[PDB]
Amino acid sequence: PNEECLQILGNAEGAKFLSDAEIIQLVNAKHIPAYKLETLIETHERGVSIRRQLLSKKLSEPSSLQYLPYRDYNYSLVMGACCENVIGYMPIPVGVAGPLCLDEKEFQVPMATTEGCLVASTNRGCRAIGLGGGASSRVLADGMTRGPVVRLPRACDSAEVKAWLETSEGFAVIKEAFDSTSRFARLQKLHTSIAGRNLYIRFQSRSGDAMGMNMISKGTEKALSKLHEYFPEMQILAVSGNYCTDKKPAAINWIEGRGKSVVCEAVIPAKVVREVLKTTTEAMIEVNINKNLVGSAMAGSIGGYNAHAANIVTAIYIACGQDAAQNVGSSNCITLMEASGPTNEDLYISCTMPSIEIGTVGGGTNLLPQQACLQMLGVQGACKDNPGENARQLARIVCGTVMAGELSLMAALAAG
Amino acid sequence: GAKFLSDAEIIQLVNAKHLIETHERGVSIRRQLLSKKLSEPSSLQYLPYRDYNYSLVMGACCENVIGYMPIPVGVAGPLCLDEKEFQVPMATTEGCLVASTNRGCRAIGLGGGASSRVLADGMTRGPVVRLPRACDSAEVKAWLETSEGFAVIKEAFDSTSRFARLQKLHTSIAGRNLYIRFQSRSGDAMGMNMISKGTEKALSKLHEYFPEMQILAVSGNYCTDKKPAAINWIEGRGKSVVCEAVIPAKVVREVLKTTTEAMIEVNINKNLVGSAMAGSIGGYNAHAANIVTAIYIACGQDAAQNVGSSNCITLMEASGPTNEDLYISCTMPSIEIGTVGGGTNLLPQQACLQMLGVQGACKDNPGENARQLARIVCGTVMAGELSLMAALAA
Amino acid sequence: AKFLSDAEIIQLVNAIETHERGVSIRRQLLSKKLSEPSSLQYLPYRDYNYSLVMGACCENVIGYMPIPVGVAGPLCLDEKEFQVPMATTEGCLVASTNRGCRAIGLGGGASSRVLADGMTRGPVVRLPRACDSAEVKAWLETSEGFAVIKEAFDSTSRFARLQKLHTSIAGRNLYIRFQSRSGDAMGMNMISKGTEKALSKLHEYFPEMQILAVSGNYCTDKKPAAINWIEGRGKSVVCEAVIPAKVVREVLKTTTEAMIEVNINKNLVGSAMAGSIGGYNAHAANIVTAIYIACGQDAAQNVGSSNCITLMEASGPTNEDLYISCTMPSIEIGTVGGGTNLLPQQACLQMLGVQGACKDNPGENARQLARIVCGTVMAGELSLMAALAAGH
Amino acid sequence: AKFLSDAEIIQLVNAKHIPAYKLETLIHERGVSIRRQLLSKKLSEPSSLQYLPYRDYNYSLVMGACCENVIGYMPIPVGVAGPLCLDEKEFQVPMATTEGCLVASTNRGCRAIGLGGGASSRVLADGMTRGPVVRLPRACDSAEVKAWLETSEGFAVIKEAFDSTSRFARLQKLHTSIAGRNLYIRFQSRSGDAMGMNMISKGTEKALSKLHEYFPEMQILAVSGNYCTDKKPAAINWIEGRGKSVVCEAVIPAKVVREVLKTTTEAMIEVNINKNLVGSAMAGSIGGYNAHAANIVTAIYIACGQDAAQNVGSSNCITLMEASGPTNEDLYISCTMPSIEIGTVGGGTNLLPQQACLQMLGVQGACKDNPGENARQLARIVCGTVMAGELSLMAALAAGH
Numbered sequence A: 001p002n003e004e005c006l007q008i009l010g011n012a013e014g015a016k017f018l019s020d021a022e023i024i025q026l027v028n029a030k031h032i033p034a035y036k037l038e039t040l041i042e043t044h045e046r047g048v049s050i051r052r053q054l055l056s057k058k059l060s061e062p063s064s065l066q067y068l069p070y071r072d073y074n075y076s077l078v079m080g081a082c083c084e085n086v087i088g089y090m091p092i093p094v095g096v097a098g099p100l101c102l103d104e105k106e107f108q109v110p111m112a113t114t115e116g117c118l119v120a121s122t123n124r125g126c127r128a129i130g131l132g133g134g135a136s137s138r139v140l141a142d143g144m145t146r147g148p149v150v151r152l153p154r155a156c157d158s159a160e161v162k163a164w165l166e167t168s169e170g171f172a173v174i175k176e177a178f179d180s181t182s183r184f185a186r187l188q189k190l191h192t193s194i195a196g197r198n199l200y201i202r203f204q205s206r207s208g209d210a211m212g213m214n215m216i217s218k219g220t221e222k223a224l225s226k227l228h229e230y231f232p233e234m235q236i237l238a239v240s241g242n243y244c245t246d247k248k249p250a251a252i253n254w255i256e257g258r259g260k261s262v263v264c265e266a267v268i269p270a271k272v273v274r275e276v277l278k279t280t281t282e283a284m285i286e287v288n289i290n291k292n293l294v295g296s297a298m299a300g301s302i303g304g305y306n307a308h309a310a311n312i313v314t315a316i317y318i319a320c321g322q323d324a325a326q327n328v329g330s331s332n333c334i335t336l337m338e339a340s341g342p343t344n345e346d347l348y349i350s351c352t353m354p355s356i357e358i359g360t361v362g363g364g365t366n367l368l369p370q371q372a373c374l375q376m377l378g379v380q381g382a383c384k385d386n387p388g389e390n391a392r393q394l395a396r397i398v399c400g401t402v403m404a405g406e407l408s409l410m411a412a413l414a415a416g
Numbered sequence B: 001g002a003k004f005l006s007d008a009e010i011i012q013l014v015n016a017k018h019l020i021e022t023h024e025r026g027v028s029i030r031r032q033l034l035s036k037k038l039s040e041p042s043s044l045q046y047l048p049y050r051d052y053n054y055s056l057v058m059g060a061c062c063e064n065v066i067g068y069m070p071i072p073v074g075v076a077g078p079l080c081l082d083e084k085e086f087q088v089p090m091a092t093t094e095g096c097l098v099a100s101t102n103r104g105c106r107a108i109g110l111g112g113g114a115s116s117r118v119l120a121d122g123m124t125r126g127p128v129v130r131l132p133r134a135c136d137s138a139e140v141k142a143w144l145e146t147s148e149g150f151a152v153i154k155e156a157f158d159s160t161s162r163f164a165r166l167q168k169l170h171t172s173i174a175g176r177n178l179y180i181r182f183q184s185r186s187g188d189a190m191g192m193n194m195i196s197k198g199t200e201k202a203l204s205k206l207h208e209y210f211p212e213m214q215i216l217a218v219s220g221n222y223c224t225d226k227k228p229a230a231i232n233w234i235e236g237r238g239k240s241v242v243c244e245a246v247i248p249a250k251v252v253r254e255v256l257k258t259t260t261e262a263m264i265e266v267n268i269n270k271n272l273v274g275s276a277m278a279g280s281i282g283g284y285n286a287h288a289a290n291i292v293t294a295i296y297i298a299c300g301q302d303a304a305q306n307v308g309s310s311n312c313i314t315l316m317e318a319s320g321p322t323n324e325d326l327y328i329s330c331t332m333p334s335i336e337i338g339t340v341g342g343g344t345n346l347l348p349q350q351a352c353l354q355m356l357g358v359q360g361a362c363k364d365n366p367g368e369n370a371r372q373l374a375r376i377v378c379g380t381v382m383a384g385e386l387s388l389m390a391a392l393a394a
Numbered sequence C: 001a002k003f004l005s006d007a008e009i010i011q012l013v014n015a016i017e018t019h020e021r022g023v024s025i026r027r028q029l030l031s032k033k034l035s036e037p038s039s040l041q042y043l044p045y046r047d048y049n050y051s052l053v054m055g056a057c058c059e060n061v062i063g064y065m066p067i068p069v070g071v072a073g074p075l076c077l078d079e080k081e082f083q084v085p086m087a088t089t090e091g092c093l094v095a096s097t098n099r100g101c102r103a104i105g106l107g108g109g110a111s112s113r114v115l116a117d118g119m120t121r122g123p124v125v126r127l128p129r130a131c132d133s134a135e136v137k138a139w140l141e142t143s144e145g146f147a148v149i150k151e152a153f154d155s156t157s158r159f160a161r162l163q164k165l166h167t168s169i170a171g172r173n174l175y176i177r178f179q180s181r182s183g184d185a186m187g188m189n190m191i192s193k194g195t196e197k198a199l200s201k202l203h204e205y206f207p208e209m210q211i212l213a214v215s216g217n218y219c220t221d222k223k224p225a226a227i228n229w230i231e232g233r234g235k236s237v238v239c240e241a242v243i244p245a246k247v248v249r250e251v252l253k254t255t256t257e258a259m260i261e262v263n264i265n266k267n268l269v270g271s272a273m274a275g276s277i278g279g280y281n282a283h284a285a286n287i288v289t290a291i292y293i294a295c296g297q298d299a300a301q302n303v304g305s306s307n308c309i310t311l312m313e314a315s316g317p318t319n320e321d322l323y324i325s326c327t328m329p330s331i332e333i334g335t336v337g338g339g340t341n342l343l344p345q346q347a348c349l350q351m352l353g354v355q356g357a358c359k360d361n362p363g364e365n366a367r368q369l370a371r372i373v374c375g376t377v378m379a380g381e382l383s384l385m386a387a388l389a390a391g392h
Numbered sequence D: 001a002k003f004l005s006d007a008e009i010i011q012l013v014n015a016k017h018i019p020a021y022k023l024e025t026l027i028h029e030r031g032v033s034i035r036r037q038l039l040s041k042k043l044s045e046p047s048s049l050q051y052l053p054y055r056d057y058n059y060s061l062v063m064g065a066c067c068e069n070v071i072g073y074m075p076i077p078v079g080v081a082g083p084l085c086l087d088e089k090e091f092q093v094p095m096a097t098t099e100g101c102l103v104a105s106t107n108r109g110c111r112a113i114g115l116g117g118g119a120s121s122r123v124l125a126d127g128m129t130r131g132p133v134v135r136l137p138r139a140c141d142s143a144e145v146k147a148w149l150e151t152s153e154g155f156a157v158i159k160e161a162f163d164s165t166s167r168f169a170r171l172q173k174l175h176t177s178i179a180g181r182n183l184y185i186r187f188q189s190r191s192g193d194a195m196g197m198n199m200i201s202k203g204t205e206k207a208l209s210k211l212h213e214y215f216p217e218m219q220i221l222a223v224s225g226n227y228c229t230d231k232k233p234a235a236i237n238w239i240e241g242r243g244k245s246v247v248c249e250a251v252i253p254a255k256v257v258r259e260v261l262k263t264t265t266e267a268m269i270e271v272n273i274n275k276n277l278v279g280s281a282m283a284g285s286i287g288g289y290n291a292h293a294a295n296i297v298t299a300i301y302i303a304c305g306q307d308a309a310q311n312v313g314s315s316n317c318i319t320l321m322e323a324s325g326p327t328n329e330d331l332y333i334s335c336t337m338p339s340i341e342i343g344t345v346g347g348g349t350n351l352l353p354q355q356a357c358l359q360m361l362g363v364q365g366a367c368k369d370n371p372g373e374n375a376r377q378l379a380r381i382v383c384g385t386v387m388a389g390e391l392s393l394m395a396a397l398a399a400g401h
């Protein structure tokens, strides 16, 4: 009825003795507040069921959520960690491009997308590479960043703090405070910029196999606590002052790197360019120069000297539990093509991606389906013997798959 | 046919270099084939695949399919936008993102609501052609800028589809390269394939006037699609949108745990000065990409287009009788979006579109559903900016 | 003053007849305040025509700075020959540019085209709300709205002919980019006059509009900006030439294949790694700056006027000939007004056959000068790139 | 050749008895006169050089050093803006320009700064750069070279080869970027008081010679691969700095903003945010978050014998304005300029008229007891004068009319 239901709710034995309708009655009349539903209802799926039911009555079409699935999904690894106000899950089709012949190994790359032909095209690119003797890649740099903004009374004071951070002694003190927060914390050279009394400080460090935002933030907050002891008039405006730079386009990531900086390359014989890619080396180069270099230049691109790196980065990231919003900066790529061999008929190809933001532990990689795709690549979880090696390998795979994707689309655009 | 054989027998046929009548059994066999090639043969255990509607995916949205990836969906709302309320779905695995955005919606609702406008509408495709000499490409640019030249090109472009309605051309020369940016609305479709078809016919017509022209590529990165580029920021691409709200001083204190004065200081020195020092083009915001990407995954959009669709400048100012109220606006000139085609043909993705009342084509007013979804995106972005900026202020 | 002494006038102030004595007195007054009173010893000031400078080109004038002018030519451009003046203090610059001119000449000369023409100004206005700024953008975009604004703008001057508007919104800010030719003048003052009269007219339709500044940096004038690269500003120009393989080896001391390699990997890839917007060239700014100083241009406008993409590819039957092109979207320039009122810089404009207004075809002298700047830049690219390729 | 006449030498070249442009070796003031006379008859108007000055100017320091094929010189009017009250000092700033009202406006900016207790500046960083592109057979090999250059022992070997070419050559930390088999190497060092291009180029070439021993396969494609970056707009100069990075600031009392600048603190903050931050942002600027730094930079440079072409990057500036004081009524202003490329020795600073302008500011030539102090000081004057210019123009725009 209503009164009886509240007696049963407050009875230490609880909400599981009420029906869905009785609980909703109690919400509509203002006896139980919308937010408290999380702790009161026992099972996670039943919490989702009720939130959906409440939501449906507020929609102009109450049957809207019919085909949004929710049942029998492991919400235990999601509640309090990955999502709030959960009403179900969104299934994204997963496909496989491979084998990807990279650094003398073969990889079957999972790709989550709803764009027709993207996987097939990426697959034909892998085929060209494989018959061409495989690709090779190198991690050139490694370190996630966080770029807080502090304010001092005057610009002369901000300059003083900058000079202090650049002394051997001052940096060593900040480094100890940063490095004390974690096993993996290992602060690299600080990069700083002034704008008046503003001072942007870019902390960079490895972070084992995790993407590292949480870890770099704990090291950063304690590093600024130490800096405040030497400069007590300094104010910390924001733990992020956009100098990182995270999830926005920025030259600083392209130039300094962020996360993993990777280069990949292959040489495709003329015969493979002809039979797999249906074009010539000469035609490919002409398209690459005038589209990926000259065209991006006329559009005023910073870091966007590629055909569709973002397609590959986004499909792999969604499949592999990465933060897909980091496609903004992680897609940064320059794709170069030149003639190779004795008569300039073989295609040399390289992709350079200075800011791959990636990890195999933490965040979405804690969910089991996301982990199935990480296991396909042999990169799931933390590498105990060699910390960071799995995330490094996953970066290489992304760069190699991007190259495969650049090969195929460019050959398609070359013919017509 | 294949139904009279077992799994092991069909697999024997594939291994000897030599069809299946259900989509799901096709998926199963591909998974078994793939699993023998992996170092951990059990790695696919927790990748689900059963009972998914593969009939709308095969031959349309994905190839070599081995299952699906579940992304948790949460709701941020109610979002009070243009005298209406929306419950915004957000597919994400980042803890706190949905809660933070939800808090931004709460501040906006208590402050009277947000208001938005679509400022421009047209998807683009930017091919690169070339002529024997730069003088020749200059002749072609000139011809295209005459009203008679543009009219014959518009006639060719427009004949390919109902919604193909060529707007003003934008051209750029680099030596004998000519980059031509074609632009048009596309109903409620995002419109890539449609504009591509109009482009092919228009260039074919241009060749009749200029036979020495070579079409080097149907995209010469002048569009620009899925790469950062100032041209999308300055000219727009897809929907250009602005949203705004005024948040009373009291609400900023109670819901957001800061003050108007503090919000302004952080916005200016983070989203304007900070982004400036970082050398940003179009990234003058805190985390528009989090909300764009989450809404996109949930609503069947092309998540790769978060690259350009995330472009956003966030501005905060003093407001009201005593300058204690918080004016906020987000401006997003290049939201690339649609409610038909691509991932929006799938049923779960269509559930999230039905939530917002923007699913499929609007018959009475073509494009209105895609326009409305772009406004919701800009409003949900503004909500997400409100809260995170407030969190960073404290 | 005529009956007084240099010293008595100086004591009057502490406690004029001609311009040169006004300069002499200012120099002496200033020399008192310097730690080294004889600093101005070798700063020349005598026998300079100060009448055209006062109240027009410079204030508090203590003299003038001599910048060596050298000549690079002949430059065979559009079947004409040009002796290009270059005011510089950088050694080897004129000499290198000259070698590039010689290379082009032996390849049959350069061809250029003006692709677009219109100086801009980009005010920022504010409305009470973003919805009001959007209403104004929409109004400006209708044919009737644009026509009202065009009539206003065009009424201020005989050369004021308003082209298509370009606008951008940022909340309640609206940025409006006005564009028009301006005869042979660079045209900032003219464009500004037309802009303010047009904004006044816009205010009659939208009284709540606040005009924040007549430049809101949307122009964009004398700062690096992608809008100039993509939409253009002033004159947009392309120049090209084909250098025979024999000329590349003999005059330039390199090969076609080596030139293409250096250009791709320095001017495209290198500039791309450096995060350049509009700087896809070797040293356009050197040539631009030198011509500008010599021809009475606003040298500060070298910021955007130097915007350039230099391309090189194989040409001819053998694929051994060198094709070169420079594309310069935003050359800001004029042959009337400002520093081109002065007689010495007019001498340099007279060398080029472009001094003053073109009466038969207004704007044609400024266009011609922009073609010369782009051609001379291409010559400078040719030579510096050759020298980088051959490597000492 | 002095025993012949003008008309005779010209008759010899026209008749082709003597090679034309190989005559000024046999013949400086008269060498110019003959080049002009020969040149005038090739022109559509043979009297066009009439009013181009050439007599009574020292061409000896100019010939084979600053200019070639010289036909005269171009006078640029020089105004003075001052006193500029900067770091407890007072400067009279030479500004060579032909733009009306520029000197006057900058002057009003100086006047407001002086009446607000003056400005303060700091050099934040210092070092000229050169950014060659080298090529290895493969990206993997280019990666090898980048890892080697990053080891402390690889760096010291390169640092010793770099520092050997000059006493001022002190190589700072190397910055590298890979693009396939391309490696771009940004060499940076102080250069005393010189702007330092030729000096850094010397040390770079020797340094690459050393690197060529450890990796014989390396091709030096070009001594500049645009990674410096010199005389083109580039985010790398904005983010890393180049030449001198400098910051300047002052507080203008409210009353001074009203009486001298004819506006208010509130109006100035508003215009600055929406023009120099938001406006530049909408226009797609990297490094151009200012009103007209280029005007001031260009004018000082021309007057002081700097390379005016380097105004492209030297003008990079962000101008910030903010409420100051107890009632938020005073104006805080600051200009940050990360890439002022400048020098007081070498190039155009060797010419005497240019040296007079340098002497005016007390920075001509080398500072013997503190090397580089004169160029640093000039950099600070540039940034201070830029801030004066921003003050005045922004107030003019804020008021209107």
Ligand SMILES: CC(C)n1c(CC[C@@H](O)C[C@@H](O)CC(=O)O)c(-c2ccc(F)cc2)c(-c2ccc(F)cc2)c1C(=O)Nc1ccccc1
Residues within 6 Å of the ligand: A116, A117, A118, A119, A120, A121, A122, A124, A307, A308, A311, A408, A409, A412, A413, A415, A416, B125, B196, B218, B219, B220, B221, B223, B224, B225, B226
């Ligand atoms: C499937 C993808 C990878 N793809 C695209 C879309 C890429 C899109 O998401 C980003 C681009 O917009 C980025 C850019 O280039 O600016 C096109 C495509 C591209 C551009 C265009 F204008 C029209 C179509 C093509 C394609 C290009 C030429 C053909 F003649 C045909 C198709 C393919 C593609 O790779 N198809 C493909 C199928 C089976 C096997 C091999 C190959």
Ligand SMILES: CC(C)n1c(CC[C@@H](O)C[C@@H](O)CC(=O)O)c(-c2ccc(F)cc2)c(-c2ccc(F)cc2)c1C(=O)Nc1ccccc1
Residues within 6 Å of the ligand: A146, A217, A239, A240, A241, A242, A244, A246, A247, B094, B095, B096, B097, B098, B099, B100, B103, B286, B287, B290, B387, B388, B391, B392, B394
């Ligand atoms: C959940 C998200 C939206 N969030 C983040 C991550 C945003 C991330 O995806 C983009 C950023 O990297 C973009 C940028 O700013 O550069 C932070 C966060 C940000 C930066 C940082 F260094 C440390 C943490 C915060 C946060 C900020 C201040 C606090 F004091 C605490 C948390 C929140 C956040 O919104 N938390 C939140 C929870 C419940 C309710 C309300 C509010």
Ligand SMILES: CC(C)n1c(CC[C@@H](O)C[C@@H](O)CC(=O)O)c(-c2ccc(F)cc2)c(-c2ccc(F)cc2)c1C(=O)Nc1ccccc1
Residues within 6 Å of the ligand: C090, C091, C092, C093, C094, C095, C096, C097, C099, C282, C283, C286, C383, C384, C387, C388, C390, C391, C392, D130, D201, D223, D224, D225, D226, D228, D229, D230, D231
């Ligand atoms: C005279 C000028 C045009 N020049 C320069 C300086 C250009 C300078 O102001 C802009 C550059 O910095 C822009 C850039 O490329 O980044 C160099 C020069 C360039 C770079 C460098 F590291 C060392 C020297 C060269 C040069 C280059 C290679 C040689 F092996 C020798 C000289 C010349 C030049 O063109 N000299 C020259 C003389 C007679 C005839 C032909 C040719």
Ligand SMILES: CC(C)n1c(CC[C@@H](O)C[C@@H](O)CC(=O)O)c(-c2ccc(F)cc2)c(-c2ccc(F)cc2)c1C(=O)Nc1ccccc1
Residues within 6 Å of the ligand: C121, C192, C214, C215, C216, C217, C219, C220, C221, C222, D099, D100, D101, D102, D103, D104, D105, D108, D291, D292, D295, D392, D393, D396, D397, D399, D400, D401
């Ligand atoms: C003398 C210069 C420094 N100045 C300019 C031109 C600057 C020009 O080279 C760069 C700009 O284009 C950069 C930019 O803002 O984008 C304007 C000017 C600017 C823009 C415009 F649209 C109309 C005029 C002004 C000015 C501005 C408002 C007034 F109401 C009047 C004039 C002055 C100026 O400083 N005048 C001035 C005179 C005596 C004393 C004090 C002050």
